[PDB]
Write a protein that binds this ligand. Structure first.
Ligand code: FAD
Ligand code: FAD
Ligand code: NDP
Ligand code: SF4
Ligand code: SF4
Ligand code: FES
Ligand code: MG
Lengths: 279, 471
């Protein structure tokens, strides 16, 4: 069959939460894993992280930021609509060890993505500091939810409209310069943010893991669309990750590859917008 | 006997029309042409006929041909009797007649091909299946099979919905089992749906088999990656037996410098985007695909030919870059010829050394090493030997088609399953794996092979499952 939307919540402008009926995925999903979805028969497959699960309801939760045609179209869906295809849980679960103090860094929709990982880290006994990065105050979401699974939360806005002014990396650099004990940094967000976090921590030798976000098609290892270079070796993020040692990732290659379809992505979005103008 | 040495030709669409779309190139026989071709067959005795020995499942080729000739005046009866004969050994004749490498199989063995053109067995088999489908004759025979089903109460799971799994499922259903197929992608068909393009395997032919499975009472669950969505142990608890038909779906990638430059695709990615996601219809369909003005396709098999001919249909100038010569290529001869006709350019005795990019990370050129032929290797073909001479050729896009291999990620998670060093599941003479009650077939046990072998293994495994569960 298809996959019923049980609930939709607008968390912030352009940030839409969907609770989806999928008892198989709910039963098996672990923090860090993702799904591929396809909305309808003409659609493309896109990856989205499993931000929460509810085994008692047989549901999973995904949070999709509006960035282009597929996520804008998804943003119009309501409870009782259906997602045609949902494949999961995909990827390797995040590795949850007692590390000591873990700094969890979520940028934008990455704040939803880090929630299950932060929760698992906390349940394993780690001291958890969550740095949340947003562009501006109206995009802030899930502060209380992250606080519920963290020992400390630092909210940043680029423009200083709420919390600490600056980037995620400004908050992290402040912790380092204060001499705070940090045993692991986990980063999830835009590739430019994950690269910046990795470059900040590398001179300090702080173990840093990033959840990579390359282009995906099947999501099961068949094709290499999602390939990355890690420690000089080709890996397929959907099956070998998507989490890797951030200090071994070829960030410039990843960002180059993510830009390949920009012109076609614009054409597709423009067509969808043009064909919805009359009302 | 006297021999009519020239084949009756099948009509094909013109190159100029067909390079503008993904529609089927070869239009197949009409009844009148098929009957004329059938008349060329010498009707060698079944207990000798070399075409039968060359068919991997030993279809009674002279018998089905005879059924056409003996019913010259009643095409529906002719086709019904011919299809009945074929279906004794082959579930997928509309597919295999189109895609078998017959020059290495039935037709390569046909006696008429020693002095002229072999009997066009594949096109006759295709004709029987296609005519039957167009006239509901296959449905008639299928309903006849369905009447004979006696449900036995036992449940079997199939992992993978390619030709092996689809075939195994149908045979088990006919034996009375309650069958569920689990498929990771959003549509079933395996390579038949995502790999081989519509210009030689129309999706209608695969969809017909899915309709047949619906009528047989088989359940198909898509979006199930076994090992993740459902565990293998969960299947063992719920099912009386399992058949693993997971193919060889991971790309082989050689560590060429520059292979991650933009514009370089595996053939699996390129073909999946084109065939499964209909990217050639972008932006009507949402999945994009990008080819530059000049495309290189690395390899010489069917995958390479399919990628090259697909890229040509997107408007590019396309080169096959192959490390041996024409004689050694492994693609179907008919499709090499179609590629030549359509304007694919061929460069032989070359292999990539590295891919060269521009400033923005986009492919700009390929440095190629020249090769020379040496002694025959294990396959009996002269091996390629590098000469040390290299040169640089400009390209905007490259498609890597150097083979596929099984997914070790899935395989390692299957508790207790023995797999060889090439990723092939080890099976006994009954296609049973190291886990009792778990069987395997197709590319999962052979590495990349053929549709007909996957079909044959699915039927053999169904019989073995029945024996195992009946004892
Ligand atoms: C493992 C993984 C988990 C992810 N989890 C989330 C999540 O929880 N929430 C969320 O909002 N986003 C997530 N993403 C990113 C999401 O996949 C893309 O934003 C989405 O595909 C954009 O598609 P679009 O058509 O809406 O916009 P498009 O115009 O198609 O793309 C816009 C941007 O998204 C990227 N992108 C395009 N196509 C793909 C593709 N097929 N796969 C991945 N990225 C692509 C491009 O770099 C581009 O800059 C995840 C990506 C990956 C790889
Ligand atoms: C491009 C290309 C062209 C070809 N052309 C020809 C030709 O002209 N003639 C010819 O004879 N042969 C050809 N072949 C070879 C032929 O397609 C294969 O030998 C045949 O398809 C094998 O089928 P299979 O069912 O054994 O495996 P597959 O066809 O790979 O079937 C496996 C299917 O099961 C699903 N699956 C896999 N793993 C899992 C898992 N862990 N969990 C759940 N589901 C899973 C997948 O979705 C997949 O579709 C070609 C192959 C390719 C790639
Ligand atoms: N099973 C199928 O459905 C069929 C598959 N094929 C082709 O074969 C491949 C899969 O089967 P198989 O033939 O066993 O795959 P292989 O592993 O044999 O490799 C595929 C082809 O690519 C060439 N190749 C292999 N490795 C390299 C390398 N490192 N550098 C350059 N070229 C290389 C080979 O040429 P060579 O060995 O001639 O030197 C070979 O013919 C597919 O890519 C497909 O294109 C073709 C027909 C049918
Ligand atoms: S070998 Fe050629 S001629 Fe003899 S039977 Fe088979 S097909 Fe007819
Ligand atoms: S199946 Fe392949 S080999 Fe056997 S007859 Fe039909 S075409 Fe010739
Ligand atoms: S998306 Fe195809 S291998 Fe990862
Ligand atoms: Mg998109």
């Amino acid at each position: 069959m298809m996959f019923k939307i049980l609930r939709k919540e607008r968390l912030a402008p352009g940030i839409n939460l969907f609770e989806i009926e999928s008892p198989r995925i709910a039963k098996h999903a672990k923090p860090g894993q993702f799904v591929m979805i396809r909305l309808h028969e003409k659609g493309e497959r896109i990856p989205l992280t499993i931000a929460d699960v509810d085994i008692s309801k047989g549901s999973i939760t995904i949070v999709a930021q509006e960035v282009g045609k597929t996520t804008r179209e998804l943003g119009t869906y309501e409870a009782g609509d259906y997602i045609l295809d949902v494949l999961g849980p995909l990827g390797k679960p995040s590795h949850i060890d007692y590390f000591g103090t873990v700094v969890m860094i979520g940028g934008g929709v990455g704040v939803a993505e880090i929630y299950p990982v932060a929760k698992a880290m906390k349940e394993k006994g780690n001291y958890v500091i969550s740095i949340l990065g947003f562009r501006t105050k109206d995009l802030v979401f899930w502060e209380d939810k992250l606080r519920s699974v963290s020992d400390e939360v630092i909210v940043t806005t680029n423009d200083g409209s709420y919390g600490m002014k600056g980037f995620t990396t400004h908050a992290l650099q402040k912790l380092i310069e204060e001499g705070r004990k940090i045993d692991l940094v986990h980063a999830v967000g835009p590739a430019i943010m994950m690269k910046a976090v990795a470059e900040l921590t590398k001179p300090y030798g702080i173990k840093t893991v990033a959840s990579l976000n390359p282009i995906m098609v099947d999501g099961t290892g068949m094709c290499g669309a999602c390939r990355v270079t890690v420690g000089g070796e080709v890996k397929f993020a959907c099956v070998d990750g998507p989490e890797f040692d951030a200090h071994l990732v070829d960030w410039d290659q990843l960002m180059n590859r993510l830009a390949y379809y920009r012109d076609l992505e614009k054409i597709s979005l423009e067509k969808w917008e043009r064909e919805r103008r009359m009302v | 006997p006297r021999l009519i040495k020239d084949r009756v030709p099948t009509p094909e669409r013109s190159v100029g029309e067909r390079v503008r779309d993904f529609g089927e190139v070869n239009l197949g026989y009409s009844w009148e042409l098929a009957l004329r071709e059938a008349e060329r067959c010498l009707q060698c005795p079944v207990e000798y006929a070399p075409c039968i020995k060359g068919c991997p499942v030993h279809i009674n080729i002279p018998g089905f041909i005879k059924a056409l000739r003996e019913n010259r005046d009643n095409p529906s009866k002719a086709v019904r009797e011919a299809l009945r004969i074929i279906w004794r050994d082959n579930t997928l004749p509309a597919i295999t007649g189109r895609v078998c490498p017959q020059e290495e199989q039935c037709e390569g063995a046909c006696v008429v091909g020693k002095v002229g053109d072999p009997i066009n067995i594949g096109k006759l088999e295709r004709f029987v299946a296609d005519y039957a489908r167009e006239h509901g004759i296959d449905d008639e025979l299928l309903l006849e099979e369905i009447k004979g089903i006696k449900r036995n109460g036992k449940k079997v799971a199939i992992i993978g919905a390619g030709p092996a799994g689809l075939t195994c499922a149908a045979d088990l259903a006919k034996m009375g089992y309650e069958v569920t197929i689990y498929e990771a992608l959003h549509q079933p068909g395996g390579v038949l749906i995502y790999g081989i393009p519509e210009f030689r395997l129309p999706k209608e032919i695969v969809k017909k088999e899915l309709e047949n499975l619906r009528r047989l009472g088989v359940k198909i669950e898509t979006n199930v990656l076994v090992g993740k969505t459902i565990t293998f142990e969960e299947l063992r608890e719920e099912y009386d037996a399992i058949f693993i038909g997971t193919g060889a779906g991971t790309p082989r990638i050689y560590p060429w410098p520059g292979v991650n430059l933009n514009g370089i695709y595996s053939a699996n990615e390129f073909l999946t985007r084109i065939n499964l996601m209909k990217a050639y219809k972008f932006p009507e369909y949402d999945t994009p695909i990008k080819v530059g003005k000049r495309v290189a396709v690395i390899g010489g098999g069917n995958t390479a030919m399919d990628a090259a001919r697909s890229a040509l249909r997107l408007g590019a100038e396309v080169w096959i870059l192959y490390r041996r010569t024409r004689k050694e290529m492994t693609a179907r001869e008919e499709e090499i010829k179609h590629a030549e006709e359509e304007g694919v350019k061929f460069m032989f005795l070359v292999t990539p050394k590295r891919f060269i990019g521009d400033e923005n990370g986009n492919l700009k050129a390929i440095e190629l090493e020249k090769m020379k032929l040496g002694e025959p290797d294990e396959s009996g073909r002269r091996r390629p030997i590098p000469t040390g001479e290299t040169f640089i050729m400009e390209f905007d896009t490259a498609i890597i088609a150097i083979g596929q291999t099984p997914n070790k990620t899935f395989l390692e998670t299957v508790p207790g399953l023995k797999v060889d060093e090439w990723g092939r599941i080890v099976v006994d003479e009954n296609l049973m794996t190291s886990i009792p009650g778990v069987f395997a077939g197709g590319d999962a046990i052979r590495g990349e092979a053929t549709v007909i072998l996957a079909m044959g293994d699915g039927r053999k495994a169904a019989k073995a499952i029945h024996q195992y569960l009946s004892k």
